[PDB]
Write a protein that binds this ligand. Structure first.
Ligand SMILES: Cc1cc2nc3c(=O)[nH]c(=O)nc-3n(C[C@H](O)[C@H](O)[C@H](O)COP(=O)(O)OP(=O)(O)OC[C@H]3O[C@@H](n4cnc5c(N)ncnc54)[C@H](O)[C@@H]3O)c2cc1C
Ligand code: NFU
Ligand code: NFU
Ligand code: SF4
Ligand code: SF4
Ligand code: SF4
Ligand code: SF4
Ligand code: FES
Ligand SMILES: [Fe+3]
Ligand SMILES: [Fe+3]
Ligand SMILES: [Xe]
Ligand SMILES: [Xe]
Ligand SMILES: [Xe]
Ligand SMILES: [Xe]
Ligand SMILES: [Xe]
Ligand SMILES: [Xe]
Ligand SMILES: [Xe]
Lengths: 253, 291, 437, 437
């Protein structure tokens, strides 16, 4: 079979999403060797314009007052079969929610939206920083979804489903997700997972229940993501040993 | 009751200037906004008014509840950056204990006041205590860093030396206290406009009780629209009391024809901008507060 | 004089472009390298936020060097409020800081080698490719970065956007096992970075002995004084940094003034030279208009009224009187910083007391006084200035290393074949998201 | 070896001459540049005079740079007696100091351009002449100097021999209108000096690319290392200076020793080479005797036992590690100092409080202790040393920048065609009245 064609599109991001991918180490080189061609990535290669892509890893959000930027993200949807919001800036805005303009030398650069507000997004990879393991897993599963037998494209399509459901749920991420859609919903069980995943130590548990420092939270959506009562697809997660073995196989030398 | 589709609904329109010479010494134009609030205070139509007072950096405006003639005059002159006038609208009826609040500002600020009067959302007591609005014409506004960049880089002037600023006749004008003048072509300034002004469809402050501006009248003189019953009672009384020199707008150059043309360019340009938000994306668009 | 423009740049972080005026031979007469990254405005959104939040937001300025913005921002708050952090918190911050310099320099090796020749040949390095020696070189680099990112996560809580720093010190000290593990990793890393350092120095020495390089088919002559400028250098420490809490700060805020691109960049021009063969997609179409004064997205900080170079050569010139300048000098200086990083880590681990305190007993809330902190980030002096009052940021300012290097690199472009203008740029290890923030 | 002598020099301040030993090709082997300005003896006449008078006399050492001697002399009295001046007096002195650096550098543009070519041609600049572009360049320079002299008179009382400085501060603060006016002038001046700076840098770059220049008819080859020396540099600040009142002075008086020309200049020689065609009036007649050891009118100050270079290149090498040397390097460094002057003025005006105090409440009369002050005058470190007792100067000494540069420029003369020896000299912006005092 053919390797899929993968591009890295960089909007208003910090390149930490790209770095996370590279922090797969030899796993990334195994992927690039056997399953994917990087057709585009301004940081690593000299391809000046957005080619056609099977999978586009888009990082960062969109500044509505930068013409070239609105064009790049429209062009990316046009040129790509699967669009991935890579990281919390692309999924949910993250720190660019806080942008409000007035700084040199473009005081009018004021308004920033996550990509799903301008184009349709197929898969979310939430996190700030996003976990290398997730980016790898999503890349391998995208390859099975496109060049595997029917048994794999079925596995791969079930794995990716909650990440696709997140892209259809909305473009907002915040500590309050855990209130709205978990505690307020009767679903919280006090496991503490949200506290472990928060990257700015904004979450403590008081008497088994989440307490959010909302003026510390940078609005990344990680905690609802990781919460085992947001999505819990029993068909995938109960096969953890098997799916882990498959993934390790796909990277073995 | 005319109903221009670019000048809003109004009773009459004359070209005026205050007869109070001390007020005219630093007024931007004819001194209409200052003279109307001073007179409203002395007569008892208002007991206080929000104005753009002096702030903490040079040429940065700071909203304040003025309650004396002297505090009102402190707000003379146009400041070309944002002054969040409405932040004190509710507080005026609380700690300040006002019964009859005045408000001054540009067109969007008049709209906020009218919205608060009809849809008060945590704005208790405001609807019935707004007593007088005076609205300025406004083509667009800037942030402070924008005004800094225009004045200091493009005009090459020190802000601590500037006595007056004016947008007119296609140029940004800076006047210094020692007597020099500098200009900037308005094409250069277009990157520096506040993006939220690009969806504004109101030029002569349609929703004010009285409206006032510069265009249409000679230097030192204001183009004034009287619009509401409140605007009419107060303006009549003030002319009767000698507070104003008038002249019908028809017998003044450039007069109401120039004004209608600049209003028309603003709405059509911005209306286009409003239309494109709808298809800004691919299968997706941006919000429209007007839908 | 003609006008050629490369947009976007590649093999650097972020979004910039080169707008070059060239003579009849295609040599730069006056080039402008400018940012076209949209301005997120961190310094303005900071105002009114808590002193705890602002460093965690500023970290998200850049994911290659988040350590630099977390530390410079946190220590600007500590300096504004007068907070002295415990010794064991300082030791963990230095370990975090040196680990991150190792990973950043190694990443930059990946970005610059495609312009370099396998010594003595006319084959350029291709690292992607499953051929030697490229592939065993990529393996060394991958393990260096991995060691570096692991040490950073241990001492810093997270390798990208460290969680452990806080106003007053760190959230956590590390366990006896953690300390053994960082020591073990830094022993392995010291061997590797010595190998990599020697490897890169030989490749650069071979480049200094070439007369031309090949760019999209053609031979491009390699000038002797490639990338020279007369701006001088500015550095605050050979390793860590300096703050206004110090008895003798090594940065003088009285010598700094930030202006707008207005004073140093070119005005409007029109592109009358184009090359569709430039790898890979050609240059800007003829007839395009450009205005670096107005398209540049950064401010221009100056020292004694002039732009300056910052970064690894800035540091070695300031502290050891390193006396070579230009593109290849910058590459050399950067590689020479590899071993210090690992010796520092090991010295710091040796003095670290894993039972020691990491949080100052008292954190004052601030009275509105100005403080500043300089972090010697992988690319240069990173200076954050702050006024904190009642635990809130009332005034904030960031003078980031690539911001300093933009006007200085631009001037360094004179005398270069426009086809290797990007090579002059890459010697600065540019981070355009940082520079713009 | 032959002996040619140029006397007097021209297109510099004051009265000096060049006494050159040349090889069979006319290249300098060992040249002596020495002062022949009569010694007015300011330092000796100072003894017994009041501490108020001595700075006003010392100002009359030189009318191009009177600010430097007024300030260095006044602040040496303040340092000897232990007087701390008010902040608003310091701010006015810095405004005065930076304005004067602008006018001095611009004046020096007038003096050096006749040796420079309109770029790309073989026409030399003639500024006198009512032709372009010379005439619009003279107009820019004339308005720069005029702005500079006006700011100096406002903050300093007088543009030549400022009246406002006094022991303990200034006679006058300025009015709100005065402050607005200096701000307005410095805004206009910043635009102009940027233009002039770019203009001069291009002219110098064109000179660095020439192989010869024309001197009284003949082609004179332009050596690559023109004006190189190995003496190093000495500087105390990038802008203002330093005094013995400072917590950490930036000059060390323990490293200084002034000797007589005896140790560094040549003994008696006889001129056996002459050229009547040297523009305009030829050189010294053959058979004339010369003795630089005995005709030199200055003393030779040293730092670590050796002469040093001072001035704008000294400053940029010390504070930014500026790494070019020689004649054209010196010209470049000097032009790069234009913008700092105007940014400083504007920053200072912004902090000045026109209602603030300008005179220290107490002026002590002195107990005979030694104090010193360094002013970074337009040409280099200007150091006055003093002992004041009972309001009288008991001991005085002046180490003036051109005094430092005399032996150092002399050594820089090696390897130059004797016909462009004067060009090597002019890069130092010499002031021979200063050097002799
Ligand atoms: C951004 C801005 C844009 C404008 N654009 C136009 C235009 O395009 N065409 C035209 O004819 N006129 C325009 N005007 C109005 C004009 O410049 C005069 O200000 C107006 O005619 C009032 O003059 P006056 O002599 O009556 O008022 P004065 O007696 O001088 O009193 C000044 C009034 O202006 C208010 N004010 C001043 N600055 C601000 C500010 N940033 N925000 C809110 N309120 C403020 C004060 O509360 C005060 O009541 C603009 C004003 C502003 C602030
Ligand atoms: N090194 C580095 Fe960053 Ni991505 C830059 N420039 C900043 O501090
Ligand atoms: N600059 C200068 Fe003077 Ni005319 C000299 N040398 C002195 O201080
Ligand atoms: S999600 Fe975090 S790591 Fe990714 S671009 Fe946004 S700030 Fe960087
Ligand atoms: S992760 Fe989910 S279920 Fe577990 S404590 Fe947090 S909100 Fe409650
Ligand atoms: S609380 Fe922490 S994990 Fe959840 S959205 Fe805020 S920053 Fe992210
Ligand atoms: S243009 Fe409209 S929205 Fe912008 S300031 Fe003027 S009245 Fe307000
Ligand atoms: S929506 Fe969460 S503060
Ligand atoms: Fe900044
Ligand atoms: Fe002397
Ligand atoms: Xe990367
Ligand atoms: Xe990589
Ligand atoms: Xe990939
Ligand atoms: Xe990639
Ligand atoms: Xe998908
Ligand atoms: Xe990947
Ligand atoms: Xe995918």
């Amino acid at each position: 079979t053919n390797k899929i064609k993968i591009g890295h599109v960089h909007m208003s991001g910090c390149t930490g999403c790209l770095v996370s991918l590279a922090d797969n180490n030899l796993g990334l080189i195994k992927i690039l060797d056997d399953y994917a061609d990087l057709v585009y990535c301004l940081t690593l290669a000299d391809v000046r314009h957005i080619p056609e892509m099977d999978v586009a890893l888009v990082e960062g959000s969109v500044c509505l007052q930068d013409h070239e930027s609105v064009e790049d993200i429209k062009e990316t949807r046009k040129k790509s079969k699967i669009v991935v919001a890579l990281g919390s800036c692309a999924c949910y805005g993250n720190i660019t929610r806080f942008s409000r303009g007035g700084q040199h030398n473009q005081p009018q650069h004021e308004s920033y939206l996550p990509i799903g507000d301008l184009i349709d997004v197929d898969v979310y990879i939430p996190g700030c920083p996003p976990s290398p393991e997730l980016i790898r897993n999503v890349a391998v599963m995208a390859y099975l979804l496109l060049e595997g037998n029917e048994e794999q494209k079925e596995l791969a399509g079930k794995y990716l489903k909650p990440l696709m459901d997140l892209a259809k749920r909305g473009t907002s991420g915040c500590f309050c997700d855990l209130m709205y859609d978990v505690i307020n919903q009767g679903l919280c069980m006090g496991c503490g997972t949200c506290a472990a995943s928060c990257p700015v130590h904004a979450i403590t548990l008081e008497f088994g229940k989440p307490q959010g420092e909302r003026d510390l939270c940078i609005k990344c959506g990680s905690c609802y993501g990781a919460c085992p009562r947001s999505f819990f697809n029993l068909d995938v997660i109960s096969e953890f040993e098997n799916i882990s073995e498959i993934i390790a196989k796909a990277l073995k030398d | 009751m005319i109903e221009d589709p670019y000048l809003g609904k109004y009773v009459t329109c004359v070209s005026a200037r205050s007869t109070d010479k001390e007020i005219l010494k630093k007024a931007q134009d004819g001194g209409i906004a200052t003279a109307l609030m001073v007179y409203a205070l002395e007569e008892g139509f208002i007991d206080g008014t929000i104005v753009a007072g002096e702030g903490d950096k040079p040429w940065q405006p700071k909203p304040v509840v003025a309650m004396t003639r002297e505090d009102i005059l402190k707000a003379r002159g146009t400041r070309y950056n944002i002054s969040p006038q409405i932040s004190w609208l509710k507080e005026a009826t609380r700690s300040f204990g006002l019964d009859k609040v005045g408000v001054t500002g540009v067109c969007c600020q008049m709209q906020a006041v009218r919205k608060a009067q009809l849809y008060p959302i945590n704005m208790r007591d405001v609807p019935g205590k707004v007593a007088f609005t005076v609205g300025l014409f406004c083509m667009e506004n800037f942030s402070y860093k924008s005004l800094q960049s225009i004045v200091e880089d493009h005009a090459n002037q020190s802000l601590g030396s500037v006595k007056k600023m004016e947008i007119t006749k296609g140029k940004f004008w800076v006047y210094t206290e020692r007597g020099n003048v500098a200009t900037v072509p308005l094409k250069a300034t277009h990157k520096y406009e506040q993006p939220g002004c690009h969806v504004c469809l109101d030029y002569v402050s349609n929703l004010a009780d009285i409206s006032t501006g510069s265009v249409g009248s000679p230097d030192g003189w204001s183009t004034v629209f009287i619009r509401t019953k409140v605007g009419n009672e107060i303006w009549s009384k003030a002319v009767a009391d000698g507070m104003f020199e008038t002249k019908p707008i028809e017998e003044v150059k450039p007069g109401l024809d120039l004004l209608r043309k600049l209003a028309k360019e603003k709405i059509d340009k911005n209306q286009k901008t409003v239309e494109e938000r709808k298809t800004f994306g691919i299968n997706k668009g941006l919000r429209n507060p007007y839908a | 004089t003609k006008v050629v423009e490369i947009s976007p740049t590649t093999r650097l972080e972020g979004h910039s472009k080169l707008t070059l005026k060239v003579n009849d031979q295609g040599i730069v007469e006056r080039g402008d390298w400018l940012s076209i990254t949209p301005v997120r405005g961190i310094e303005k959104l900071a105002i009114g936020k808590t002193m705890e939040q602002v460093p965690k937001i500023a970290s998200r300025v850049c994911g290659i060097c988040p350590i630099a913005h977390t530390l410079a921002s946190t220590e600007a708050m500590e300096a504004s409020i007068g907070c002295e952090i415990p010794t064991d918190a300082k030791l963990l911050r230095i370990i975090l800081h040196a680990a991150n310099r190792i990973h950043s320099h190694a990443l930059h090796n990946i970005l610059i080698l495609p312009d370099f020749y396998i010594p003595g040949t006319e084959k350029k390095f291709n690292l992607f490719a499953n051929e030697q020696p490229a592939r065993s070189v990529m393996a060394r680099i991958v393990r260096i970065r991995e060691i570096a990112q692991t040490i950073a996560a241990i001492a810093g809580g997270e390798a990208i956007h460290p969680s452990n720093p806080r106003i007053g010190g760190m959230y956590h000290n590390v366990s006896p096992r953690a300390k053994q593990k960082m020591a073990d990793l830094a022993k392995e890393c010291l061997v590797l970075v010595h190998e990599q350092m020697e490897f890169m120095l030989d490749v650069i020495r071979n480049m200094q002995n070439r007369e031309f390089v090949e760019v999209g088919g053609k031979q491009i002559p390699l000038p002797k004084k490639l990338g020279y400028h007369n701006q001088g250098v500015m550095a605050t420490a050979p390793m860590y940094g300096s703050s206004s809490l110090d008895d003798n700060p090594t940065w003088d805020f009285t010598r700094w003034k930030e202006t707008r691109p207005w004073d140093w960049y070119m005005g409007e021009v029109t592109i009358d030279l184009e090359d569709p063969s430039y790898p890979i997609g050609g240059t800007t179409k003829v007839g395009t208009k450009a205005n670096p004064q107005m398209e540049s997205c950064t401010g221009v900080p100056t020292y004694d009224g002039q732009p300056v170079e910052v970064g690894p050569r800035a540091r070695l010139a300031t502290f050891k009187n390193f006396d070579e300048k230009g593109t290849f000098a910058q590459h050399i200086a950067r590689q020479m910083e590899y071993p210090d990083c690992c010796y520092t880590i090991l010295n710091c681990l040796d003095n670290l007391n894993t039972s020691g305190k990491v949080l100052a007993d008292h954190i004052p809330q601030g009275d509105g006084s100005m403080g500043w902190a300089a972090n010697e980030a992988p690319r240069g002096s990173n200076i954050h200035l702050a006024r904190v009052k009642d635990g809130k940021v009332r005034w904030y300012d960031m003078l980031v290393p690539t911001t300093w290097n933009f006007p200085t690199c631009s001037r360094a472009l004179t005398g270069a074949p426009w086809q290797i203008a990007e090579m002059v740029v890459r010697a600065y290890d540019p981070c355009v998201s940082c520079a713009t923030h």
